[PDB]
Amino acid sequence: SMSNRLIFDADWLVPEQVQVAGQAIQYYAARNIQYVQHPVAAIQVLNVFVPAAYLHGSSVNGYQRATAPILMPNTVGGYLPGPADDPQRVTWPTNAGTIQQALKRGYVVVAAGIRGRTTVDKSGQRVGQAPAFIVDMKAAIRYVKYNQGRLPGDANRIITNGTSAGGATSALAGASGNSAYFEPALTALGAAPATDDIFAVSAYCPIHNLEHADMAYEWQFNGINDWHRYQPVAGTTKNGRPKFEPVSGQLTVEEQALSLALKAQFSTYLNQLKLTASDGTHLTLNEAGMGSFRDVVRQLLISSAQTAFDQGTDIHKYAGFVVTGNQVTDLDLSAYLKSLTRMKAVPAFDQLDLTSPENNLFGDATAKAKHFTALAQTRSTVTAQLADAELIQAINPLSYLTTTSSQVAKHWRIRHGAADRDTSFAIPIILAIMLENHGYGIDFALPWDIPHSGDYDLGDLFSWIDGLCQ
Ligand SMILES: O=C(O)c1cc(O)c(O)c(O)c1
Numbered sequence: 001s002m003s004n005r006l007i008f009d010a011d012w013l014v015p016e017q018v019q020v021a022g023q024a025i026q027y028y029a030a031r032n033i034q035y036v037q038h039p040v041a042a043i044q045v046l047n048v049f050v051p052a053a054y055l056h057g058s059s060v061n062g063y064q065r066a067t068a069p070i071l072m073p074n075t076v077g078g079y080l081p082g083p084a085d086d087p088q089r090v091t092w093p094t095n096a097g098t099i100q101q102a103l104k105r106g107y108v109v110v111a112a113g114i115r116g117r118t119t120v121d122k123s124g125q126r127v128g129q130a131p132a133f134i135v136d137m138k139a140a141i142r143y144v145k146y147n148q149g150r151l152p153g154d155a156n157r158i159i160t161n162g163t164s165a166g167g168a169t170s171a172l173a174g175a176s177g178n179s180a181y182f183e184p185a186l187t188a189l190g191a192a193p194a195t196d197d198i199f200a201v202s203a204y205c206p207i208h209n210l211e212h213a214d215m216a217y218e219w220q221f222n223g224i225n226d227w228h229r230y231q232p233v234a235g236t237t238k239n240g241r242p243k244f245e246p247v248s249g250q251l252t253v254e255e256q257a258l259s260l261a262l263k264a265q266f267s268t269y270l271n272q273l274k275l276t277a278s279d280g281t282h283l284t285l286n287e288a289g290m291g292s293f294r295d296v297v298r299q300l301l302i303s304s305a306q307t308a309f310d311q312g313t314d315i316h317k318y319a320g321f322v323v324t325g326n327q328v329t330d331l332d333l334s335a336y337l338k339s340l341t342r343m344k345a346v347p348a349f350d351q352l353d354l355t356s357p358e359n360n361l362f363g364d365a366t367a368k369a370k371h372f373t374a375l376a377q378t379r380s381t382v383t384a385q386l387a388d389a390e391l392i393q394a395i396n397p398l399s400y401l402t403t404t405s406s407q408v409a410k411h412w413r414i415r416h417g418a419a420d421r422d423t424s425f426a427i428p429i430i431l432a433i434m435l436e437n438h439g440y441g442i443d444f445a446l447p448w449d450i451p452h453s454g455d456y457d458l459g460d461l462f463s464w465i466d467g468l469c470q
Helices: 096-104 132-146 165-175 180-189 210-221 253-272 292-310 333-340 357-361 374-378 389-394 426-437 458-469
Strands: 014-020 023-034 045-051 070-073 108-112 158-161 200-204 226-236 242-250 321-324 327-331 411-415 441-445
Touching: 014 096, 023 096, 045 096, 070 096, 070 132, 096 108, 096 458, 108 132, 132 158, 132 165, 132 180, 158 165, 165 200, 165 411, 180 389, 200 458, 210 253, 210 426, 253 426, 292 321, 292 327, 292 333, 292 426, 292 441, 411 426, 411 458, 426 441
Parallel strands: 070 108, 070 158, 158 200, 200 411, 411 441
Antiparallel strands: 014 023, 023 045, 045 108, 226 242, 321 327
């Protein structure tokens, strides 16, 4: 209710500690803060964790109470609900380890709970489908910025972080600062009266640009007709993590035919983005999907391999690399992708029977799931409607670089593992190039043999943050 003034009180902070690399890290915690006045789901609370020094007038890693970066990680995966995280949390999902390391680094951490596609209200109604995830992230950001000074840390140094769907969340927050599209939703929640633009973005394998991901997936994997992914088994770990196991399949003749069309359409989509290299050349693909853009993907994988090679890693785990002397001189991309293996079938994102996480994400209070591409709606195997075009646009980070309607974070660090096949490499690469093209700071790479995952390079992430903030 409006009795919730959304005013943070440092008096709420209580002392705790956690071991990191065999040493005690002292911090203060305040949990379960209702960050909007009119929440519709119990998950909509946030936790605040502060390096202990900041409650005693001292410094950590060059930062003080007033100047410390504010890291805002999320636990969103598969566009499911992401509970408020905690350095003490052991239940799945969690990035507790990252919070612990962040505190050691001197960052204030504000970990918000975020609704997801399965979130229902007290009456069992669905209230977490798009764009709930990003509304909640923005509401938490507004809570933080509204409470500048009261909350330890610099509210002008908010850095979001997340993996996969959570990476898309982080990227979207960075791209869509103060967009008018979300104002109605935020007003309805009674979010704090403040801005929601942020300082920097960290994103691991952001699963985004969903309405073009099917074309990108087939551009990449056409010609590879076996797929290998996971399905759930009964039971969880003691900490609630769902159990999985490998299951393979083979594309049908019909899927193979559909793949070829999706692949062909990608060339036009890609070309019409008008992406450029550093020297300014238009990056493109021809009718058969070859060209300068394809060469960029290849080069990024060669760079990834060289970095691993120099560390003594055997890059011939995967096929296609040409090593001359101690230099990775070339790559047969098709061969690499074949050894890497296709994970998803066709279409990979907009499934014709509405069964994908993305389909459910684009459902609403009436329909459990929707299509979000013309192709899938046309080819639908079940009764279905297309999601609202503006909504699709609104939750795509790219939209804010290509049609200005927001304030964009100046600093971006994006990673997508060289072994990650949840989405085509073209997807994060398009984001990175578009960022660079529009003058934003972008640190991008495809780390060698890293699977679908995040937070695996914390030393480097934190050095990047410190480079921006100290
Ligand atoms: O958050 C994830 O792990 C995730 C989310 C997705 O929407 C998705 O299509 C995927 O392959 C992985």
